[model samples]
Target: TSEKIASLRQEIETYLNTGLLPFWITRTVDKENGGFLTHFDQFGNDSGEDEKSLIAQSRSVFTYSSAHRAGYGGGVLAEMARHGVDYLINNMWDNEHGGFYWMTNRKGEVTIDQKIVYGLSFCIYSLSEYTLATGDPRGREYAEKTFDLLQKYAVDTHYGGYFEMFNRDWTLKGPGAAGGDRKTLDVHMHLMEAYTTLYECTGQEIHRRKLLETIELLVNKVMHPEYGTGIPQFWADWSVAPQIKFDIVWGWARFNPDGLKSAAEDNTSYGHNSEFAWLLMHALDILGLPYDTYREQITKSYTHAVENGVDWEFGGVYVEGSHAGQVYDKEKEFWQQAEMLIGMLDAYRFLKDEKYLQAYENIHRFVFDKMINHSLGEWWPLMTREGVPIWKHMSHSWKINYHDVRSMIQSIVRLDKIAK
Candidate 1:
């Protein structure tokens, strides 16, 4: 077991150091504009996409800052992180409104100025990560400013959860299916993610109180009652709503001409549940809470993914399934696989179940074999069940190194503990 775990750690480390980090460090920066250039094709060449998104820019900041903190890139990595942080603050931040903008053109002009919580969540997340990594006051100043803005504009005084989808001036958007009337577990999960870092970076009592509140809210309200999987969307009143396509998309969704490929009427994300499992564990660890207290709740997520979300014959995690644990979407996605790899490894570390390691190995082999672009040092966006690439892009505004880079870093960390 010692030799096996040690080898796994080495393999993840080699790919991360030799290829993944080097590729972005050497090539992906915008020399003139002072931000990272996304839109790379399958061969690691430029894909010519000329737009900026709050989500991607902030995610880039998180990736580099995280790597730097993990002691990978030294000053070079912090510089990369600074490069992204600067773009976010200079270009995306709405100085007057005090929240980040949603989208921008290549020239850094505001394209869509709507203030979405999903995007704002990453702004807080990345800025805190950058602050924690480099101790740059700028990162903390902006992150704190964002949190203040949310408390002012986005928070629902009456409802338990925060309001999503707002205008630049802090007004709610229209309430259609595509419109921003609905609240989402996706965004809230990220808020929990952001608040965790916010509390860790600065031990402000407000941050800690808010973090504890969000944890209580999710556990008591958002998670499904029977399956323990994450429910996708809800109304402002906290009632479960059938999953519908959103007007503002944060990820790749070109399957339909309108926008997103609907996740059907009702479904849960296998990847999200797994991601939540590890992230919750991280938050608890940061809070000095014992893992033993939450093992039963956490175990439900990993068990659900292993039993239903995993495709044993096809060899990668499935996209979405019913709450009763049935796989409906067969295509494998980059984020889902990435999250499960880390989650499964943590599962083994915590639960000491051989099946979880076996699950990790299955998804890890699929990722290394099919998902990763071997020479390019980036991951493909989408793939069929049998491991064929559907969209052959290396990087997009939505799909950045945040997921895959994080997957490697977290997995390597977990393996280090296990191997030791």
Candidate 2:
């Protein structure tokens, strides 16, 4: 066991240093353009396109900024992060509207103007991390501006959570704001993430208060009491809504036996549950809350995921399960595996159990051996339940270096502590 622990530590360190960090550090930078290239094929060839997504730009900024903070690439990563920040401020931010645009052209012209809270949260997330890493006052100023905008328009004062989307001018869309009035655990989870980082960076009281409120909302409202897991996505009035359908392009909705007609049925995600388990722990630690305050619920959520969500006979975690524990989707996403690795390792850190460590190593092996595009620089985006690669594109509108890089960074830090 000791030898295995040592081996895992070395493997993770090497992967972070050579495999993960270097891939993005070198390939993602745009020589002619200002921001990083957002689209790349599975073989690592740039798409040679100019259109950029606000989400990709923000995530790239967060990745490099975080890398710099972790002492990974030093000046080079900071410079890359700066490139992203410049593009974000100069192009993505809605100059008149005071929020970031959803999409922009290669030359910094706005393409899509509607403001999605999901995308805006990422802008805050990246800018806050950039500010933390480089001590750039502009980054903090922009992040706070986005924070204030969300509070003004997005926060549902009546219902106690933020709305999901808005028009270009920040008005509610559709009849009765029905189209964008829905709430989601996913958005709130990211808000928790963004607020936590913003608080750490500025120690601002408002950021601290929002971060604590998000933590409380997640614990009491989002998570199901009996299941001890995140409820199948919700709506603004706090009623249970059908699970949000992931795009078919991501291969998540491909194997739908219940069919598109049944999209309104309750569903559960092992990935989100496990991911939240560790994220909650991180938030609690940052807030200086004792583990005993939330340990039982967090542990129960994790246990439900491991017991019902993971395909133990197979190597990787399943995509989603119904309320009855039936696996609705079997495709193992790259991001889910990445999140599981961090979640299991974090569990091990708190419980000091070999079982969690074994789960960590098992998922680690699956990711390294199967999910990673060894020949290419980044990871394969989708895989079959049998651990076979299904999608070839390495980078896309959604897939970026954030989860993979963050997992490697967190794993290395956690592994060192366990090895001792």
Candidate 3:
């Protein structure tokens, strides 16, 4: 076991040190074009010139900012982060339209022009981190612009939450936008994450107000006391309709065809509850507010994750499904499990509860033991139910550095400080 731990630590360090960092630096960077590469092959090699998604650019920036903070690599990391930011400001932000475009062509033309709330949140969160990492006022400006854009376009005053999507000019998207959406919480859950980080950095009153509103939305509306958890999706009015009659022809099924039988039998909880709880707890800590309410909320969510969403025998968290009160979507997604670790670690740090730490350790062990691909460098995209790699392929897509790399770097920083 000692050998395993030692080997894992070494393997993790090696991947972070050599493979992951180098892949981004050597392969993704664009010398003449400005931003990083949008697409990459299985071996972390880039070939063509597709327009980069704002999500990818934001994620790449965060990856470098985090790497800088971790002391893993050096100036190149910061340069890459700043270069990405430069490209974003010059190319991505729609000064005429007020929000960012969903995607941009290689020559910097807007392709998919939809403005998504999630993408906005990622930009703010990443840019804010970059601002803190570098003493750059420009990064702060971009973060401020993103916050303003959310208030201007995405805020759903009628529904008391943020809208999920908007047209190119910031108009509301239709029900077509709502179909098969993977959420119960409003987009503000992520906005809360962004605002929390922004608040920590800026200590601005607007950020505080947005952060509190997000927290209150969860406490008053989103979370369900009756079910002892939050629902995975919601209507515009925050009122859930009566359970729909099951008909195979509707094409609006909740679970995948393979997962329907299990969905009927199980009570699935979204991993976001636990993930968002930690952010809320940290926000409470920052504002010096009484977090007893959040502590209780997060504890319930974490326990639900452990008891209902995690495979106790197999040792990995899935994307939140429950069959007969047990999780059935045994397909372990990399990002979901990484998110679970962050949520558990946050609870452990804030509550000093041994159970939270133990859970965190277990998930971390699962990630290191099963999720990571030692030979390939970065983690595999999905881990099979039995802990084998389902798809051994790796790329910048599929919930890339956004969570896994950021969480690892941030947690290592936290742990290093605690150790010291």
Worst 10 residues of 3 by lDDT: 245-254
13-112 per-residue lDDT for model 1 (tens digits): 8889888888788776776776777777888877777788888789889999999999885458898889888888888888887789998877778898
> How much is the lDDT of residue 420 in candidate 2?
77
Instruction: List residue ranges in candidate 1 displaced over 4 A.
Output: 177-179, 254-264
What overall lDDT goes with each candidate model? 0.84, 0.79, 0.67
Candidate with best lDDT: 1
**Each candidate: RMSD:** 2.4, 2.6, 4.6
Q: How many residue-pair clashes does candidate 3 contain?
A: 5
Give the poorly placed runs of model 2, Cα more than 4 Å off.
48-50, 175-179, 244-264
Model 3 over residues 1-420: C-alpha lDDT tens digits?
Answer: 345434435655666777666655667777687877746545555546476778878888878876786676656788788998888888888888866677876766777777777778888888887887776777778889878877886666777777667777877766533322222363567777888878877889888988899888876677765444655456668775322321111111234234434535224444666677766776787787876766667766666765666565776677655423545566777776777777766666666666665566667777777887665556667666768876655664334567777666655544443343
In Å, residue 189's CA in model 2 sits off its true spot by 0.5
Ranking by lDDT: 1, 2, 3
Candidate 2 overall Cα lDDT vs. reference? Answer: 0.79
Clashing pairs in 1: none
TM-score of each: 0.95, 0.93, 0.85
- List where candidate 3 sits over 4 angstroms from the true fold: 1-14, 47-49, 178-186, 241-270, 290-293, 350-355, 396-398, 414-420
The local lDDT score (0 to 100) that residue 361 gets in candidate 3 is 65
Supply the global lDDT for candidate 1: 0.84
Error of 3 at 347 (Å): 3.0
